[PDB]
């Protein structure tokens, strides 16, 4: 029998990803033990079934050890551990597994920077994380197991899972994305590039600088339809947080084009509405005097610095004429290096349906195809896998449910 | 020669606290080596002098090893370390220090709660953190070294350093503060310290979890103090307390005559919290424009944004009127006593300011006076001048150096 041990944490996603990295390096344990200091208090289900789809029939047992060091000296030797993974735990928990433990092998998966992780499995490229046997300091290679007992080709994935799907398929060989075309983009394709990050505005740097100074932001309708969920990364800072206010006028304009004929014009507003819903307004469709007026009203009533973000040059110039500090997205930059491929595919899938079945190909053979399916405030894409051996989105669906519950 | 080694981190405070914990457990190293994966890029000065004040004349050397496990495999064997501390590392550096290193003894500082750290040395009570010899797994006892070559008894400490001073003195023995029936100013001191809380503070936490905008009244800043940041801040949404113009106007009007009466003490105390909590972009205290009031500005923000606007006030008449206009108002009326843990530094700071404008509070160890403190305020500085009558326990002098380093690290 092969016994695998790992550590529990408050963010169980790290423990989940630690196990999956252990699975994807060839290990097929008969039993997996998660050592955690405190009771779980959050029933998590589906890992056994998800592991079944990956050709691993294992039992997952949670062993609550307790809080304290001497307590971990004694109770960590009780089990006959074969391979011990010590990545997602506490420092002292990881150290308490190297010492006083009968584990034959102890390994750790290292990530270049710790901050990119803590999300769904496969989002981080596998070139940036490598599992290391801490005893001898070598890199054990990957051999990703294929999916078994695959029932449904269709699956529901968010943006992160779609990017994870691309990265996981990269382990097997060359993964090409056919049908993208691009070349000479139209009006909708241009904003699709902006939302993905392939196109950026030179004034996006101004948003970062103003975010560092701790200033309120009000974003125009075109900002949500062109920057999308990238507004979260542009505005968020550790010191002050997410200081992007929810404009009523922007919501009103998005709502008017959302509630009814799905033309290319309507696609822009639906994309902005999904971003608007995701960014703020966590849970009032009344009239408003406009984006400029609401910035002026807040400016005279608070001591915070009010900044107005817009892609409408006429609106931005008028806002500056009233004294407001305005960031006007005018200059366009190409070749930014890094962008979210998942956001690009999400926009292009939606755009293609209202203009071409764009597919994901591996080694010159089509593997999966995707379409756009929207209902309420859900940024979900349905991908259908035509290859029964690579139906990883089914596992990603289970993981997404696990992460959402946590 | 005695050689001490530790690991470098992006937050150098963890490395600093690891060394000082090793100093306070009796270690007197002749040379201190900090192994880091990347270049420092932020010069730290004054640390050598702080170790001198504790009777340690040591050399502090930064040895950049590099990134990688195989790279750390070779370059960590160069030094003949005597004692290696592996608390402030990033696991793989700690493992690369446990393995492939000729350190005679390796120890690790354990903390009960992971988030209580990342602050000045001594802020966390020493009963919650213990240094452990990981080779055999026992607790290395404390023998706090005495201060040496201390020239000036008087020193300036902030709220965190004042708590650190009490906790550090706690290692030597029982530390009593020889300084009931509170008056109006003493009541708000209890509220700000955390000994007194309002039952409606739970509503602030719930609204913070719901992701709602906050506007706080003048009495909120003078009574809740800097705990308002903890009540509003949440990991998902952040610090969502807007800076009221009218509230600053009321505080500014009462801060600028000449005699500091009991009324002025409350407003300047609230002003200190107001500048510390928010208004980071706008600076100084000049030219605040007029406003129609806290209620009107809440209505104006409510009618222009889709966020949930919540008004915080201790004025029941104001809160009820705001509620009658539809605003979600949290009215601080009910008082909770015996809430468990409180900020001792804020308590002494609040009591020090009111006492200087109304006895003589002292800090005593085992029945013998150790230090006395007084109130000295200037702009956005919550500093208390404490004079130590025993040169053998002049720990605030070291705490001043640590506070400067922490301020330099976080611009």
TrEMBL record, chain A:
Disulfide bonds: 192-347
Recorded superkingdom: Archaea
Name of the featured protein: PIN domain-containing protein
Organism: Saccharolobus islandicus (strain REY15A)
Taxonomic lineage from the root: Archaea, Thermoproteota, Thermoprotei, Sulfolobales, Sulfolobaceae
């Amino acid at each position: 029998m092969l016994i695998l041990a790992t550590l529990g944490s408050d963010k169980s996603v790290t423990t989940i990803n630690a196990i999956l990295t252990e699975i994807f390096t060839g290990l097929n344990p008969n039993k997996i033990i998660i050592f955690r200091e405190d009771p779980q208090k959050k029933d998590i289900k589906g890992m056994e079934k998800a592991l079944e789809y990956l050709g691993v029939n294992t039992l997952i047992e949670e062993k609550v050890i307790g809080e304290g060091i001497k307590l971990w000296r004694e109770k960590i030797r009780n089990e006959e551990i074969d391979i011990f993974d010590i990545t997602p735990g506490r420092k002292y928990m990881a150290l308490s597994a190297t010492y006083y433990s009968r584990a034959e092998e102890i390994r750790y998966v290292y990530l270049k920077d710790e901050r990119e992780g803590y999300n769904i499995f496969g989002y981080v490229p596998f070139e940036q994380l490598k599992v290391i046997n801490v005893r001898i300091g070598d890199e054990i290679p990957y051999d990703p197991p294929l999916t078994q007992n695959v029932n449904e080709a269709e699956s529901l994935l968010d943006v992160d899972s779609l990017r994870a799907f691309i990265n996981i398929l990269g382990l097997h060989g060359k993964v090409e994305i056919n049908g993208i075309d691009l070349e000479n983009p139209d009006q909708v394709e241009e904003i699709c590039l902006f939302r993905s990050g392939k196109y950026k505005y030179e004034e996006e740097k101004d948003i970062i600088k103003e975010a560092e100074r701790g200033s309120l932001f009000l974003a125009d309708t075109n900002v949500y339809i062109r920057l999308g969920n990238r507004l979260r990364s542009l505005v968020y800072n550790r010191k002050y947080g997410f200081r992007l206010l929810s404009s009523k006028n922007t919501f009103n304009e998005l709502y008017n084009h959302t509630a009814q004929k799905i033309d290319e014009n309507k696609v822009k507003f639906i994309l902005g509405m999904l971003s608007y819903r995701s960014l703020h307004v966590p849970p009032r469709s009344s009239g408003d005097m406009g984006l400029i007026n609401e910035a002026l009203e807040i400016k005279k009533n608070v001591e915070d610095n009010v900044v107005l973000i817009t892609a409408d040059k006429a609106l931005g110039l008028t806002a500056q004429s009233k004294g407001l500090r305005t960031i006007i997205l005018s200059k366009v930059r190409k070749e930014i290096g890094e962008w979210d491929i998942g956001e690009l595919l999400f926009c292009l899938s939606f755009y293609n349906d209202y203009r071409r079945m764009i597919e994901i190909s591996l080694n010159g053979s089509k593997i999966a195809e995707l379409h756009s399916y929207y209902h309420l405030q859900e940024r979900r894409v349905k991908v259908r896998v035509v290859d029964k051996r690579y139906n990883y989105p089914k596992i990603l669906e289970i993981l997404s449910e696990i992460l959402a519950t946590a």
